[PDB]
Design an enzyme around this catalytic site. Structure first.
Site, short mmCIF file in Angstrom:
data_model
loop_
_atom_site.label_atom_id
_atom_site.label_comp_id
_atom_site.label_asym_id
_atom_site.label_seq_id
_atom_site.Cartn_x
_atom_site.Cartn_y
_atom_site.Cartn_z
CD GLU A 262 101.79 44.85 78.90
OE1 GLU A 262 101.30 44.11 78.24
OE2 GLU A 262 101.48 44.99 80.20
CD1 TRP A 284 102.92 48.57 82.07
CD2 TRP A 284 103.07 47.87 84.38
NE1 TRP A 284 103.06 47.02 82.30
CE2 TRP A 284 103.16 46.85 83.81
CE3 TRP A 284 103.14 47.90 85.66
CZ2 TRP A 284 103.52 45.66 84.26
CZ3 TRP A 284 103.20 47.07 86.40
CH2 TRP A 284 103.62 45.67 85.60
CE1 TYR A 310 103.75 39.66 84.21
CE2 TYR A 310 103.56 42.05 84.78
CZ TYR A 310 103.07 40.93 84.71
OH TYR A 310 101.76 40.75 85.23
CB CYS A 370 98.60 39.10 86.23
SG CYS A 370 98.00 39.92 87.55
NE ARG A 391 100.01 37.33 90.72
CZ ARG A 391 99.44 38.55 91.05
NH1 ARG A 391 98.10 38.08 91.69
NH2 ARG A 391 99.73 39.63 90.99
CG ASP A 394 90.23 43.54 85.70
OD1 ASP A 394 88.88 43.19 85.32
OD2 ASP A 394 90.42 44.71 86.01
N1 LIG Z 1 92.77 45.60 88.08
C1 LIG Z 1 93.52 45.53 87.27
N2 LIG Z 1 94.89 45.94 87.26
C2 LIG Z 1 95.95 46.03 86.35
N3 LIG Z 1 97.05 46.52 86.44
C3 LIG Z 1 97.51 46.21 85.28
C4 LIG Z 1 98.92 46.45 84.70
C5 LIG Z 1 99.46 46.36 83.36
C6 LIG Z 1 98.14 46.03 82.43
C7 LIG Z 1 97.02 45.95 82.93
S1 LIG Z 1 95.66 45.26 81.60
C8 LIG Z 1 94.91 46.36 80.92
C9 LIG Z 1 94.67 46.14 79.53
C10 LIG Z 1 94.05 47.19 78.63
C11 LIG Z 1 93.83 48.47 78.87
C12 LIG Z 1 93.93 48.87 80.38
C13 LIG Z 1 93.62 50.01 80.80
C14 LIG Z 1 93.40 50.71 81.95
C15 LIG Z 1 94.08 49.74 82.68
C16 LIG Z 1 94.55 48.28 82.43
C17 LIG Z 1 94.59 47.88 81.22
C18 LIG Z 1 96.58 45.90 84.31
C19 LIG Z 1 95.46 45.67 84.95
C20 LIG Z 1 94.00 45.29 84.79
O1 LIG Z 1 93.70 45.05 83.74
N4 LIG Z 1 93.25 45.19 85.72
O1 LIG Z 2 98.03 41.54 82.68
C1 LIG Z 2 97.54 41.76 83.52
C2 LIG Z 2 97.80 42.42 84.57
C3 LIG Z 2 96.93 42.65 85.78
N1 LIG Z 2 95.57 42.28 85.68
C4 LIG Z 2 94.87 42.31 86.92
C5 LIG Z 2 94.22 41.00 87.54
C6 LIG Z 2 94.26 41.56 88.96
O2 LIG Z 2 92.85 42.29 89.13
C7 LIG Z 2 95.25 42.47 89.11
C8 LIG Z 2 96.31 42.30 90.01
O3 LIG Z 2 96.39 42.27 91.48
P1 LIG Z 2 96.75 41.22 92.53
O4 LIG Z 2 96.32 39.68 91.52
O5 LIG Z 2 98.29 41.61 92.30
O6 LIG Z 2 96.09 41.45 93.75
O7 LIG Z 2 95.54 43.11 87.85
C9 LIG Z 2 95.18 41.23 84.55
O8 LIG Z 2 94.30 40.71 84.54
N2 LIG Z 2 96.19 41.05 83.58
#
Ligand SMILES: Nc1nc2[nH]c3cccc(Sc4cccc5ccccc45)c3c2c(=O)[nH]1
Ligand SMILES: O=c1ccn([C@H]2C[C@H](O)[C@@H](COP(=O)(O)O)O2)c(=O)[nH]1
Ligand SMILES: NC(=O)C1=CN([C@@H]2O[C@H](COP(=O)(O)OP(=O)(O)OC[C@H]3O[C@@H](n4cnc5c(N)ncnc54)[C@H](OP(=O)(O)O)[C@@H]3O)[C@@H](O)[C@H]2O)C=CC1
Ligand SMILES: NC(=O)C1=CN([C@@H]2O[C@H](COP(=O)(O)OP(=O)(O)OC[C@H]3O[C@@H](n4cnc5c(N)ncnc54)[C@H](OP(=O)(O)O)[C@@H]3O)[C@@H](O)[C@H]2O)C=CC1
Ligand SMILES: Nc1nc(=O)c2nc(CNc3ccc(C(=O)N[C@@H](CCC(=O)O)C(=O)O)cc3)cnc2[nH]1
Ligand SMILES: Nc1nc(=O)c2nc(CNc3ccc(C(=O)N[C@@H](CCC(=O)O)C(=O)O)cc3)cnc2[nH]1
Ligand SMILES: Nc1nc2[nH]c3cccc(Sc4cccc5ccccc45)c3c2c(=O)[nH]1
Ligand SMILES: O=c1ccn([C@H]2C[C@H](O)[C@@H](COP(=O)(O)O)O2)c(=O)[nH]1
Lengths: 491, 510
Positions: A262, A284, A310, A370, A391, A394
């Protein structure tokens, strides 16, 4: 009459080979040994263990030495060694130590060892002599009296070998101030806590674990975009050291390949998620489906196209986006190249930032970024450090991944700038734990962290620019994590 | 060994017309009760007051329950008090003495093994006498930040600098600022000065290893200690580096503060902060104004040195009229991405209005995690007079409709700019919160390159000898008139109870 064992072992409990040490010299480990063993004190060692030591060191200075054997010029057994410590030396001796195998197993079978000072060598090495199996073995790898850990240290490294330090055990003006602190504390159910039996928590992963705990105990229950519901806090901070080891989390297996691929993706400025999915990295996919794109009012997007997000902002900020097949070379601002340039020509500049947050392009992207900003910093020792603002976090799923990601980025930038990686600073805005992750996380919080691995860049000589990195120029050395903990991604 | 307990205005006022000068301060009363009552069984505490204080207290509350009441008077008698209200069961009979030494003599003669602590409770006469005798070991002072009409004052005592600007009584305790009924105040304690786990300390021993702001203060609840400790930490542990301006710098990387907005306002008190400046500049931001002269002719010359012809030229921008900061801060806020011309151009409808976006998103969908405002636009950076330092802010709403705000700052002049920034975005948070029908909770300060200039170090060292004062309260006036963020004017605000130390001269690193 308490006894303590002092050891340095691999995850497979290996401690020696050919009457010597399996691993190259561990300086910090030796300092640790020498410091621990004196405060006089007594050390007890086996026959061959005495021979393992160089002659100039053999009389372990400022400590009563006891070799045990039946051949040399000194007791004939470990119990005899203890008896010799009880009869004479009853005064002047403080605590005792035992420093080879067989002596360890003697001390264990005779059940006299109360504490274990273990140096967790993270790398495996060829060995023919192993430390005995014991209740508590969980602290080395994923293999009634039991040894609970109480002390877990920061990860150190010497000669490309990462290791830890753990300690196991068998199982007037204040008065005037007091009544005010009292009522101030009074106002204001059962606090969860990461492995509470560990009092001395030097490991840097405890930042993450305590973060989870703090969110679960002190966060607010809110709704969100996903409808899953979260427990959240605002404004959270972590920071991980990069000079000794790499913050690849150990309480659960982190998707390293996903991280690396990534990131290389990002750097290329690729906005095609299918390039990630075809390498088995499908983090993704759920956000680039026809359904999600349509929910984002983007029916004109091809499946996989994350839009101008990104990487595209990184390499071509402000450029007009067409689709994931368009060659945007030369267009927009190259924040990465500019950051590197300013790093290599003038490291004292405080405008070395890379942003992904473009308000004029947000609606055009599959998901708003994020991790939206990073800033780099050099000191007088040519040591590079990186801040990353996020911002939305998760905590259960994304955060470790992000830590690994930007720490890795820091390593790479540091390499192409002739700088030494020092620190990754993690700034977090909306820090939340999804309600359907809570139990799994509570499972994770019962896990004591293992030594951080070190990440080596291979073929350094060949790599001169940030674009020159490939997915084969990295090795992850000494990574011994707990089992994978499955958590569904709230789409 | 006696302890005094007081509530006090900056000019040492404690009463008016045999009553309190201020509205009811419930937390102060809670403080008083808990301090005068709490005993570790057999004994109780004694409170000694003057006649007028006793008369000032309401009938129902006197004598103070579970405390031995001693009144100093010559006109009043014990039976006067006894016949005022029937003594409840289990309580002590109220005693009357003709002087403070008589009170103490009584306390020793027929209340030893009976009483624990002795508290002087009021008023000016007893405080005066107690300070004269030198019997006072500790002062429990509730610093009221606002000034009120008073005819009775707490006496002048060595070390009263903890109230206003001018054996000693030095502070050892300074709490965070509370507020009740529009009255900000805090609590300080002055003092008369004139092998379980132990076997693991050796491993700690080899992993184990100068400047500090007011070290005698042991309890440091006051949130300004974040700033002070930030200064001390940057000085002690920071690195000396070269710099864009030519002046040397001592820097650290990745720093964090956070200030509460629900009780009072974090306008730093250990030095005077240019509030008119933060207000005018913030309004200036909101308007999307890029004309520094508008700030300058209002008495705010904080931008002049960076919009001079000379500086504008050194920025390789000869086309710029003097005062034109370019497409920065406000311009990105209200018109992100819009093509810039000059500070006289109308830009309504052009670019992205991040502020309106954030506000609407706050009013309609408070759980959205995309409520951000950024001024860091890499495209327009070279067109700006100075790249934004406070470059990004994000908002947050919780259970109880409470607003919180993080601001990320890439570069931070600690001695000079940081307090101004704190005040600035705290004010922004207030305004946004009012416009969105929310309660201000917290401003969070995220700092990148955090540094002090070498020509400031002596002055900051001076500044660290000062203990902070209660934070003031920033009131929004004419709320009924104000419905939108643009509705604010310069006269719609009111700083209340701001009692800061003197100004400290620090030249701006050009
Ligand atoms: N709620 C939420 N939404 C996410 N969208 C992502 C897009 C790219 C990486 C990510 S981060 C990520 C990091 C490592 C494993 C994953 C496995 C399945 C899904 C997301 C993973 C997210 C992401 C997230 O971690 N949580
Ligand atoms: O690199 C990443 C990409 C996504 N998220 C998580 C955080 C939020 O749960 C979600 C994004 O949703 P919004 O914040 O866009 O509503 O994905 C991460 O923690 N790290
Ligand atoms: N990584 C680490 O922390 C450490 C590693 N090591 C490594 O371990 C290896 C040495 O250990 P090991 O080879 O097991 O040998 P040891 O050094 O423990 O000694 C074995 C010899 O000691 C005597 N002995 C040991 N236990 C007993 C007992 N219970 N009763 C009677 N005699 C006993 C015997 O002598 P005799 O034949 O005379 O009876 C035996 O041959 C080396 O490779 C060394 O480098 C050693 C110390 C620490
Ligand atoms: N904000 C705060 O923390 C406090 C405020 N107050 C306020 O202060 C005011 C009352 O204070 P103040 O007016 O000073 O009155 P005091 O409570 O000090 O009472 C004065 C009376 O007490 C007696 N007395 C006091 N000191 C002596 C002495 N050294 N020797 C002999 N007799 C003494 C005399 O009684 P007599 O005439 O009967 O002989 C005198 O008239 C009120 O407004 C009250 O509300 C009071 C306490 C605390
Ligand atoms: N944690 C641990 N690490 C070890 O390396 C270790 N090694 C042994 C046995 N091997 C050795 C080999 C050399 C020296 C030695 O020379 N010690 C000196 C030098 C200390 C230093 O180099 O700083 C000493 O006086 O302690 C000690 C033990 C036993 N318990 C251990 N325990
Ligand atoms: N810090 C301080 N604050 C004060 O308000 C104060 N007031 C007095 C004199 N006036 C009064 C008037 C009423 C009560 C009173 O009724 N007190 C109750 C508190 C109620 C509660 O429990 O919250 C008490 O029982 O002490 C006390 C003092 C003296 N020293 C002070 N000291
Ligand atoms: N070294 C240095 N350079 C600066 N350039 C600035 C441009 C605008 C505001 C600012 S910060 C500032 C902002 C507003 C008012 C001020 C009043 C007095 C001193 C500084 C103020 C700076 C600034 C700075 O604080 N330090
Ligand atoms: O709101 C502001 C504006 C400017 N500065 C300071 C930080 C730097 O010391 C200085 C010069 O800017 P750079 O060299 O970091 O661009 O301005 C602040 O602290 N706050």
């Amino acid at each position: 009459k308490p006894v303590c064992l002092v050891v340095a072992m691999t995850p497979k409990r290996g401690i020696g080979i050919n009457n010597g040490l399996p691993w190259p010299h561990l300086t910090t480990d030796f300092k640790h040994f020498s410091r621990v063993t004196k405060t006089f004190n007594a050390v007890v060692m086996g026959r061959k263990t005495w021979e393992s030591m160089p002659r100039k060191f053999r009389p372990l200075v400022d400590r009563l030495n006891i070799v045990v054997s039946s051949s040399l010029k000194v007791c004939a057994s470990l119990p005899a060694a203890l008896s010799l410590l009880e009869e004479e030396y009853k005064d002047s001796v403080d605590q005792i130590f035992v420093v080879g195998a067989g002596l360890y197993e003697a001390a264990l079978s005779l059940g006299v060892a109360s504490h274990l000072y273990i140096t967790r060598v993270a790398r495996e090495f060829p060995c023919d002599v192993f430390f005995p199996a014991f209740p508590g073995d969980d602290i080395l790898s994923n293999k009634e009296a039991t040894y609970r850990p109480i002390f877990i240290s920061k990860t150190f490294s010497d000669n490309g070998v990462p290791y830890d330090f753990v300690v196991l055990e068998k199982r007037s003006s204040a008065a005037a101030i007091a009544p005010v602190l009292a009522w101030m504390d009074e106002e204001d159910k059962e606090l969860i806590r990461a492995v509470p039996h560990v009092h001395f928590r030097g490991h840097e992963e405890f930042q993450y674990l305590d973060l989870i705990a703090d969110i679960i105990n002190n966060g607010r229950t809110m709704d969100d975009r996903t409808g899953v519901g979260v427990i959240s806090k605002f404004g959270c901070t972590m920071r991980y050291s990069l000079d000794q080891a790499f913050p690849l989390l150990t309480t659960k297996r982190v998707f390293w390949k996903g991280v690396l691929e990534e990131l290389l993706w990002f750097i290329r400025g690729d906005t095609n998620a299918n390039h990630l999915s075809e390498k088995g990295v499908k983090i993704w996919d759920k956000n680039v489906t026809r359904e999600f794109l349509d929910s984002r009012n983007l029916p004109h997007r091809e499946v996989g196209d994350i839009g101008p997000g990104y990487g595209f902002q990184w390499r071509h900020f402000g450029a007009a986006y067409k689709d994931m097949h368009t060659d945007y070379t030369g267009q927009g601002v190259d924040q990465l190249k500019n950051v590197i340039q300013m790093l290599r020509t003038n490291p004292t500049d405080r405008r070395m930032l890379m942003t992904a947050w473009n308000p004029a392009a947000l609606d055009e992207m599959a998901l708003p970024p994020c991790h939206l900003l990073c800033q780099f910093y050099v000191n007088d020792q040519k040591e590079l450090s990186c801040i990353m603002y996020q911002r939305s976090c998760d905590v259960g799923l994304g955060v470790p991944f992000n830590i690994a990601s930007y720490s890795l980025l820091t390593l790479m930038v540091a390499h192409v700038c002739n700088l030494k990686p020092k620190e990754f600073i993690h700034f977090m805005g909306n820090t939340h734990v999804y309600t359907n992750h809570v139990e799994a996380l509570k499972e994770q919080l019962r896990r004591e962290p293992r030594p951080f691995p070190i990440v080596n860049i291979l073929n350094k000589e060949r790599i001169k620019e940030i674009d020159d990195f490939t997915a084969e120029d990295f090795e992850v050395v000494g990574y011994v994590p707990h089992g994978r903990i499955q958590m569904e991604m709230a789409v």
